[PDB]
């Protein structure tokens, strides 16, 4: 066995996440992405060994043809150590593709951090280990561009970026379009939901939905969120007029019910 360690923040290479040594929130799934479509999912799954301490049952579910996820039924317990061994060098992955190499990661679970945005109150309340530490008035998506309900996993964080609607196939020039500079942006869905600084809606925050989907908070609440949250923490959205965040968004994993997840989709 030749093995490489994951980094954090013909043949197919696997890329595994989270990165070696990282500390992640309780909603962080193990993710393995290949750089080629995988014909034999059962075989990919087979080559991947996951060990947890304390041990917990878990299962694989694919989000697309090159990316598989693994998580338990419930959010991880703070302190859990997770080792992932992706033993795919030379494994037959279907239709004449094989694993280029083995990859490995070890990571741990940090504090339980769950922020719930309730559209009835327009408050985003942040809970650390079950205690309320922050209450943020928020302004979520307006009725015609609502914020989906559901469990979102915190992904990347950016001190400043531009959010551009054309990335999701909505032209900047159209009624729902935008090309917006924002501060203290914490990503929570691949479909473009962030918690981020919105000084332009402080009057509305706590009262009225005015965004395109994102969770607008005040500049200093956004900075606080950005400073205190990590990959894998949970934002839960409730009681909006929207639908439910898709299970296969990229950070929507926890919206798929356990039965459906467990049973998998390897064929």
From Swiss-Prot:
<keyword id="KW-0564">Palmitate</keyword>
<comment type="pathway">
    <text>Cell wall biogenesis; peptidoglycan biosynthesis.</text>
</comment>
<keyword id="KW-0732">Signal</keyword>
<keyword id="KW-0106">Calcium</keyword>
<keyword id="KW-0472">Membrane</keyword>
<feature type="active site" description="Nucleophile">
    <location>
        <position position="214"/>
    </location>
</feature>
<feature type="binding site">
    <location>
        <position position="95"/>
    </location>
    <ligand>
        <name>Ca(2+)</name>
    </ligand>
</feature>
<protein>
    <recommendedName>
        <fullName>L,D-transpeptidase 2</fullName>
        <ecNumber>2.3.2.-</ecNumber>
    </recommendedName>
</protein>
<dbReference type="GO" id="GO:0008360">
    <property type="term" value="P:regulation of cell shape"/>
</dbReference>
<dbReference type="GO" id="GO:0071972">
    <property type="term" value="F:peptidoglycan L,D-transpeptidase activity"/>
</dbReference>
<keyword id="KW-0573">Peptidoglycan synthesis</keyword>
<feature type="binding site">
    <location>
        <position position="92"/>
    </location>
    <ligand>
        <name>Ca(2+)</name>
    </ligand>
</feature>
<keyword id="KW-0808">Transferase</keyword>
<comment type="subunit">
    <text>Monomer.</text>
</comment>
<keyword id="KW-0133">Cell shape</keyword>
<keyword id="KW-0012">Acyltransferase</keyword>
<keyword id="KW-1003">Cell membrane</keyword>
<dbReference type="GO" id="GO:0000270">
    <property type="term" value="P:peptidoglycan metabolic process"/>
</dbReference>
<dbReference type="GO" id="GO:0005886">
    <property type="term" value="C:plasma membrane"/>
</dbReference>
<dbReference type="GO" id="GO:0071555">
    <property type="term" value="P:cell wall organization"/>
</dbReference>
<feature type="binding site">
    <location>
        <position position="96"/>
    </location>
    <ligand>
        <name>Ca(2+)</name>
    </ligand>
</feature>
<feature type="binding site">
    <location>
        <begin position="191"/>
        <end position="192"/>
    </location>
    <ligand>
        <name>substrate</name>
    </ligand>
</feature>
<feature type="binding site">
    <location>
        <position position="216"/>
    </location>
    <ligand>
        <name>substrate</name>
    </ligand>
</feature>
<comment type="function">
    <text>Generates 3-&gt;3 cross-links in peptidoglycan, catalyzing the cleavage of the mDap(3)-D-Ala(4) bond of a tetrapeptide donor stem and the formation of a bond between the carbonyl of mDap(3) of the donor stem and the side chain of mDap(3) of the acceptor stem. Is specific for donor substrates containing a stem tetrapeptide since it cannot use pentapeptide stems. Is essential for virulence in a mouse model of acute infection.</text>
</comment>
<feature type="site" description="Binds to carbapenem drug (covalent)">
    <location>
        <position position="214"/>
    </location>
</feature>
<dbReference type="GO" id="GO:0046872">
    <property type="term" value="F:metal ion binding"/>
</dbReference>
<dbReference type="GO" id="GO:0009273">
    <property type="term" value="P:peptidoglycan-based cell wall biogenesis"/>
</dbReference>
<dbReference type="GO" id="GO:0009274">
    <property type="term" value="C:peptidoglycan-based cell wall"/>
</dbReference>
<keyword id="KW-0479">Metal-binding</keyword>
<keyword id="KW-0961">Cell wall biogenesis/degradation</keyword>
<dbReference type="GO" id="GO:0016746">
    <property type="term" value="F:acyltransferase activity"/>
</dbReference>
<feature type="domain" description="L,D-TPase catalytic">
    <location>
        <begin position="113"/>
        <end position="238"/>
    </location>
</feature>
<keyword id="KW-0449">Lipoprotein</keyword>
<dbReference type="GO" id="GO:0018104">
    <property type="term" value="P:peptidoglycan-protein cross-linking"/>
</dbReference>
<dbReference type="GO" id="GO:0005576">
    <property type="term" value="C:extracellular region"/>
</dbReference>
<keyword id="KW-0843">Virulence</keyword>
<feature type="active site" description="Proton donor/acceptor">
    <location>
        <position position="196"/>
    </location>
</feature>
<feature type="binding site">
    <location>
        <position position="178"/>
    </location>
    <ligand>
        <name>substrate</name>
    </ligand>
</feature>
